[PDB]
């Protein structure tokens, strides 16, 4: 179902990749997470000083995979600007939240959710790290995050901006 | 995979032919795969030319709200005006994407079915998303919210004629 | 679907999938379960990169929960005996054969991103005997070699499901550096 | 669909390594996987009858008729076929490994080599005198008497690379570089 | 999966350039029709050069398979047959119907003339035609062929050479 | 399965006015309990029913039919939790007769009711909170607070909370 | 599976003229009710039947065979509700003896019936609304409006609507 | 399938007459609830005679399984435990929670205190309670129990006797 | 559902033969099939602790923990358990057969007896010292040294009834009446 | 569903399924594929009938295409070593183990109905060897014994799928009488 | 779905079996054929001189199984009267045809078909025996049967009586 473009033959995502556009669409997992990392590493290699535009529509997924992407965004040289174009739940909100400071966006009707669900024992811990990371990027107190996450504090686009997950709603 | 000149194969198919003329299809269920495709095509057509109008032909029974509203917003906030043409069925998110078309360019073919009811899809309180939908359906149609809220409650069915008078479309292509 | 990159290289205006493009930088990926299919893709790529140059480093990005011990052994062995240093970089998970593959990288060139998780549990995974699992001792020596750890320590922690964050794996000796910029 | 690929449908890593006369057997030997090896071995022979072939083997074995086809093709064609074990060579896998050119049969050190060949072979009764050509072939390449081969092919014996060198199944164990 | 050659050709396409065709796996309309297409194609390219038909099959459909046999027969170029692995049922017939003096097997192959079930009962005078075909090409008495087909006679490369199913075993 | 006289094991225990709810609360399982409660009412309406509960809950519709049937029959329905009382199980356990609700010490009790069970028609949610509050001796304000999160409880806390009256620690 | 008395638990409650519709109304579930109603009528034609309902409804054809069997038999069919009554469950609840239709407070009654159960021949849906209008006491144009709408009603509202006589609270 | 006795009793029913109960296979609501029913039934028949609880289980659900443990504890009669085959996870706990001096194993059985995954992360202070239970009944230090549970400590009948999981090995 | 049955749910042929203290193991040893034997062995013990039990075995084996449960139950209970092989006794099947009362272990003459015990046993590593109690048990009942048992339990050796008598796995081969 | 027969027998007014009722006349049935489940029902019944009387004949009605060789061997062996003569009667098919079971009946008491079909093909049907199929020789001797036929004749005709009508099986020695009234 | 009767508890077929009524319903196979043989053997044993009523509604099935039943009907002492109560195709017609001379019936609307379909090679032969058996019971020439069977000569109840498959149509 994916169309093709010229300028050479290109699928549409591949064409949009040339303009430094990366997509995450649907659930985060070893396949979808590793392809984002692959595109990010590639775009850094082409130009280490040009911004990348990371469009996110995700109900989240695996934490190991998602944190792989999150780390990669922080530690590549380029600024990864994050746009939410539908949803950003679970790891979707964290990857959104972890975009480059001042370049985190959402469309108005999207739904940002910050609760990280179920998907060895003392090992969470990981959850503490997700709260500490969300607190850095939003600026909230760690306590505020810990109270707000073990509860699916659902938020519209304007509510997420107040909370510090994104920087700008796109009304234009 | 359609009639192909020469999934992610190497070919120039019918949809790739018509994308060169800025035409875009939503055919079938709205979901993460299908919605992201529209949004990808809309972003692509904008970077090619930000002034030329896009022709977004729609035949959907609806589906996911989050993904659907993601398309709606993209239609609104890209510079190019998006024309909408209903070519069979426009229910739930189909009707909202249709009705969300640029002012003056919201078409439907004579026999099409527009249905404006929207079904569900922790939480319960969280479905004030239904109020965001009702505002936007009122904003584009021109109807009152007390009408839109009540009228978008029951499974209301419209032929193209009724969808013009209601305000979901601006014309009906008899010529 | 996998994205596609078009380039030139004094040879032609060539077209690569995103992974083949990164293979030009000597970047191989192991992503997901270690089985025959995925272990031979890795091994294939390592041989290809050696055939192109046996001295330039290889950067092996690992995000695996593990899998087959024989298939992973092939990869581990391939990493040791091709001429170029295989630098390993963990970008999510490295459990079981994955943590052996991560720890089997060149001295001083094993990395992990900060949020990655590493487990050194070596689970049970045609017909052959229990005493014939002296494959288990080889894993434990391979790990004890590469970590700098006492063999008794590796035997104690491998039948324990002992989970570690990135920096803890640094402490234990599974990696050399966590990546912080 | 296929895996790390250049295009101009696509030119995968196995193809790229076939330009270098490198061939794999990965997973169980069957009609599909065995004919692929046979077709590569024939193609490589026709490109250049004199340059060597490098056959990297990771297999639990499988079909005897299919595998014997591969085995036979390796002796038939003009090129020396070097064999390298890169994980498992079991049953037909061990036979194919052991059937590489004299002095050019390698194994990685962690590899497991199992000469036991189990049922099914495919109608089947005493006409599993296929089992006797198996053992003659295995005897010829190893230098073992036919007694020991029959003894050891009917018991599930497991060898690491060094026992496999000792036994004659392979000439070298890659312990370096 | 099938590797590719650049000069993008799949490996069987590239071997087709050298007039080499394969029957691998079960004989059925699809696989039989494929072999027929290749034999047709190669003749139109050159009707005077041999074709090399490598066979690893356990047989299968009689109609489909006899279609392949008939095409081998009635095309101009000699079709030389080489067994690599198994030749059972319609595989052993197709092996045995290669050009005279040009039927081969590699020495570890297994050849089986028995042909099972794969209409009416009286319409297995198709069975009679197969046994004639096998008799003609082997040199054997029809009585011998009919004995050895109802029995599941299993032959190695040497036995098949002695029976007349193939002309040479090659090393 | 198992059988006895002085009848499966569950039928035998139904003579001693004992009823089990075991596993998911659905139209099948709810109705058997309702049917058992009704039968026990007609057999002797003064005497007490002992209702054992080990369930992660299920349907609200099916579950509340059991709740009502406990209240609006003659007998006191004494509840005991013997493993798990989640979702509707918490409520059915909480809805036993006044002063007659028990739990075994290792039991886990969870008042949260998940979405399974459209829109504002989830005012049912307020009837649950009210039903709980009324039986718990706890304010609608904290009851809604706790049912909006995955709030686990041991038998000790459940008693202090109000959900049960006695934790069995003896004979 | 199901317990035993002295009979199985449902048969023993049939000894006291109690009948259950549990889960979906279909050929199988509806015919069991229909056979139980006939049996109770043959045991004593005057005594009241008690018909507990917990259903999301289902097949219109089968569910209307049982609704007719309630009217056609002599015994007054008391309909009690114990959790849910949607689609045919709403109709079978309403179709009980006037003076003897009951519910429990937490129950959820829904008059809406789905699509699944010739096109013009679904004039059957207009018979449905007539029969509801007859048992409720409402005008027909109120019923056709309300059905087609997902209008959820709890026991106190269902009393006001005419769908039921009482609400049990003791 | 289960044979029948006439005196039609199934064989487990007939052994119930001699106060013998089985946990065979995985511990889950169904199987756990069954065991609880039998322990309840046998006490009402006679609260002063021992019960003989034969255990061949690899464990399973913690909630369900602790329900069985608690019932064994708090009923009047001693529940003597006998391991025939396997006692892993909730099986080894249930074995170990039998009456003091009356916990048995046949000499070839395999006993494993390790308990895996089968809510929230903080709600595995259930893990703490299990390790207390195991510590209490074994006589071991909680530190030892916690070491040996996170490890997959596999014990034979003799080792389990030495550890205090059982009181006797019998021949 | 069940098979040739009297009623007064039903009284099948296995029940009718259980009145005669005859017990079967039919098909693979698992938690369901093994506990059935254990429950019968216990029931027969409780009916009458002194009269013998006749255990007719047709099994490819299966689960070691489950089967050892059966094995142990046979030694535990008071009654002599006679074992009769009626087709296959393999792995756990051969162990159960061999674990019958001294002098009361029979086999029909066409039966196949295979002492090879394969994986899976069930987490599993050196804790397959279950394998060492297997061999001690097999050694005790047969009279074979532990060497020979370890040698022969790890190779797929097949015995007809007369080799099984010779080896000590059974005391008698039913050649009459 | 299986029909049910009610009777009396100085014991009670008992109730049998149709097969248990015929078991009172010492009639056992093997119907369909020989496997572990069906071979033990047969063997169970044979032991039961012997336990009731070891001298009264048993009438074993066979309609099977065959199946497992070990399971059928059990039945064949059970037929030889219980004290009462097992008369066999073929009522449809007897192929493979079924024809061995039919032919394994008591001397002079093996029957078939006229329209029955008998094949003596012994097909291939945990892990063990090819030479270990000297089970095949035992079948061939068991058949050569019971048929009166030369062992070479049985070896020739068993790998041939040699089909026979009832009266042909009489000629070959597989049965004694065809039933004609 | 099968009801129960008194006089003792009885399923309906079991009750009807006491009046010497046997049923074959649906496809002929090892299960359904062996149960008819079992009932026939049983009814002979109860009374060897009382007729048995064999009601047949069958599309036929396996020939080995069906010929097992056919033989049993001929060689038990009782006369097996055969009634067709719906269909009697393939082996259904042969079992119908092979009822006791003068006691073979059909209801008027039933459909008798005499073609034996597909379900080693020279082995048919069996088919020759089916034609010879059908010729005995009907009285037709063997040639007539051989021509008429390798063709699905379909027949109503009155046409079957003319042909000799049954003796009487039941119009009363």
Residue numbers in the entry:
A (entry chain B), K (entry chain B): 6 to 12, 19 to 130, 143 to 195
B (entry chain C): 6 to 11, 16 to 130, 142 to 195
C (entry chain A), J (entry chain A): 6 to 130, 140 to 195
D (entry chain G), I (entry chain G): 5 to 12, 19 to 132, 142 to 196
E (entry chain F), H (entry chain F): 6 to 12, 20 to 130, 142 to 194
F (entry chain E): 7 to 12, 21 to 131, 143 to 196
G (entry chain D): 6 to 11, 21 to 131, 143 to 195
Paper passage:
Caseinolytic proteases are large oligomeric assemblies responsible for maintaining protein homeostasis in bacteria and in so doing influence a wide range of biological processes. Here, we detail an efficient protocol for production of recombinant ClpP from Francisella tularensis, and the structural characterization of three crystal forms which grow under similar conditions.
One crystal form reveals a compressed state of the ClpP tetradecamer and two forms an open state. A comparison of the two types of structure infers that differences at the enzyme active site result from a conformational change involving a highly localized disorder‐order transition of a β‐strand α‐helix combination. This transition occurs at a subunit‐subunit interface.
